[PDB]
Amino acid sequence: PLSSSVPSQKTYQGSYGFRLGFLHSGTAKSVTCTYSPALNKMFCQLAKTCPVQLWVDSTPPPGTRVRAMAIYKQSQHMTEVVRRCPHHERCSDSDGLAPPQHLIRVEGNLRVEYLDDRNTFRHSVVVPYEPPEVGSDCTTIHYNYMCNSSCMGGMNRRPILTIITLEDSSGNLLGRNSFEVRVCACPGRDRRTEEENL
Amino acid sequence: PLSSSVPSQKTYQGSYGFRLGFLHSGTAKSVTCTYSPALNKMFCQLAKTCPVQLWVDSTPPPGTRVRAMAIYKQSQHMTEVVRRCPHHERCSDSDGLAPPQHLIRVEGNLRVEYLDDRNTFRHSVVVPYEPPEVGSDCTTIHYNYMCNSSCMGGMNRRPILTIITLEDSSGNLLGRNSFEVRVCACPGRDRRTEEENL
Amino acid sequence: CSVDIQGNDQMQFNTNAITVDKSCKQFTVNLSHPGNLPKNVMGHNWVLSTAADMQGVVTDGMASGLDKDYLKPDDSRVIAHTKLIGSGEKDSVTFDVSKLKEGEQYMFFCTFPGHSALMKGTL
Amino acid sequence: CSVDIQGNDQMQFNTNAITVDKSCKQFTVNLSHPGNLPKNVMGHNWVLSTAADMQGVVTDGMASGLDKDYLKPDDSRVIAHTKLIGSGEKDSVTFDVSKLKEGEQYMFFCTFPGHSALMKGTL
Ligand SMILES: [K+]
Ligand SMILES: [K+]
Ligand code: NA
Ligand code: NA
Ligand SMILES: [Zn+2]
Ligand SMILES: [Zn+2]
């Protein structure tokens, strides 16, 4: 079932100056997760920790929430809900919280919440916003991507982007940012290779 | 009866990166099974051990399965089910597991499972995928081919292909590869013969 | 030659550093779960490997799933391990100290998906 | 004050004889399942009762079903028992050496249907 709508990917820093950051990981073959600034592309491994930093100029109020949603990057695929492939949908990798069809999970956060949208059919995962730790400049969320860019019949090898939106306690929009994601076997090599065509 | 369909021989690596591999066995007269990289063709003796190596970028989860199936290589013969000739089908060489018609068997694995497909009529043999041993980098399955390529009433000098498919516990496709096979009494000599026009 | 360890409902072991006395011939972990969450959401185990093997044990363990105590079956990299326990459960494990080296880096961790970063320590 | 017991896929305990040192205030049995079969087709428990009561325990337990671990609920003839377990699982039980007699016959056994005829021993 395609969705009747397409979620916004328009950058919106908002009142609190919401930006995304990523570790400066490099492209050694041992990296499990590395971000390309030039491509604004996260290269990460299936089910491996994928840290994403939230940077604000000023603290969002209490009750603020942080949501992640995947969509397809290409226009003809945009209305199709991004979901796990049949193989991963059925596999025995449940962490007890996430729905078996959800591409994106959050690890190490017992307040993680997952949504099947009643009306748009989109999957998303929301956690509460927490300020950075003492002496830290950003908030780090630890995502996991539970299908591969080479899975059969899921993403079926189509490119996707993640949308990170900041919301107040009622779900209203406070900020939005986005990045492309390639979930693959050797993120370091893939980033170096894709970066070589520039 | 002919099959009404033709199985796919399209290479496919899938979520875990499925590749095949073969011993670098040479072509000395003693060798029972030798693989030509230039021809992507295996030369083996009737009913002798043929190692076929499975290589993955990451370990498939438990319950994963490995299927092998023969088809003729010549398009005009692709709907004909590859089976043993009458002499060998009726001969005294059953290990109590394989059906006497099946060309392809697996030796040294009591978990072998054989299939007469009720719809396509194809034979195939399947084993549980086992991750590599301690101190090994790949998984080795030991096939036996139970007719010679020249067997009258059977393959009768038509080359075949073996298709190896990796599948999960529910039958979803994880990877596919294939290689031509010649079953003959002198595999090393016959490999030299066929490479001669390269 | 024994040690008592707990995992609470906050994805925490109550220690992050085990020492095994060179004298001991066998060593025992006594794992318990004083929290209230069941093991499909807060299942802990105590799994021992080399530091170099921890991440592989964790990834293959996660994908093995709840019904395999989140462990890859027959994993050679696992020197010793409890079973997965949830609230109110306890399990012990005993391994030979001859499986350890004095010039080697060992880690202990839970393999519950997403809890490993938080539940680890040196042995 | 403890013993380790195994039930396999061939309806065998690995010992037919348990001897409790009576300097022990409490005794503990650690049961494991080294087979591959799950507890719905090859489940194993460790059940302690007197020798006369053993047959009754087995009979009523057998009519109780897998949900009750093949034990009659609140069976007063059971001195101690583990849980019923399948392949790769484990469970232990501790009881007071208070409730035993030097001049009394005691039987341990498994109450999964059919298993007790082979899976039994003295204590
Ligand atoms: K290779
Ligand atoms: K076992
Ligand atoms: Na696309
Ligand atoms: Na066979
Ligand atoms: Zn997938
Ligand atoms: Zn023949």
Numbering used by the authors:
A (entry chain A), B (entry chain B): 92 to 289
C (entry chain C), D (entry chain D): 3 to 125
Question: Would you copy out the relevant sentences from the publication that reported this structure?
Answer:
Tumor suppressor p53 prevents tumorigenesis by promoting cell cycle arrest and apoptosis through transcriptional regulation. Human p53 protein assembles into a dynamic homo-tetramer and harbors three major functional domains: the N-terminal domain (NTD, residues 1-94) including a transcriptional activation domain (TAD, residues 1-61) and a proline-rich domain (PRD, residues 62-94), the DNA-binding domain (DBD, residues 95-292), and the C-terminal domain (CTD, residues 293-390) including tetramerization domain (TD, residues 293-353) and regulatory domain (RD, residues 354-390). A bacterial effector protein azurin triggers tumor suppression by stabilizing p53 and elevating its basal level.
The highest quality crystals suitable for structural determination were given by a construct of fusing azurin to the C-terminal of p53-DBD with a glycine-serine repeats linker (GGSGSGSLVPRGGSGGSGGS). In the structure, each crystal unit cell contains two azurin and two p53-DBD molecules. Two p53-DBD molecules dimerize in an asymmetric way and form a triangle groove. An azurin molecule (azurin_A) docks into the groove. Importantly, no physical interaction was observed between azurin_B and p53-DBD. The interface is mainly mediated by the p28 region, burying a total surface of 913 Å2. In this configuration, two bulky hydrophobic residues from p53, Leu188, and Leu201, stick out their side chains to interact with a hydrophobic pocket of azurin consisting of three non-polar residues, L39, V43, and M44. In addition to the intimate non-polar contacts, the binding interface features two critical intermolecular hydrogen bonds, which are formed between backbone α-carbonyl of azurin Ser66 and the side chain of p53 S183 (O–H⋯O distance 3.0 Å), and between the side chain of azurin Y72 and backbone α-carbonyl of p53 S185 (O–H⋯O distance 1.8 Å). The hydrophobic and hydrophilic nature of these residues are highly conserved in >20 species of bacteria strains. Notably, p28 peptide, an anti-glioma drug, specifically dampens the COP1-p53 binding and stabilizes p53 from degradation, and our structural analyses showed that there are overlaps between azurin binding sites and reported ubiquitin E3 ligase COP1 binding sites on p5314,32. suggesting that azurin might negatively regulate COP1-mediated p53 ubiquitination through competitively binding to p53.
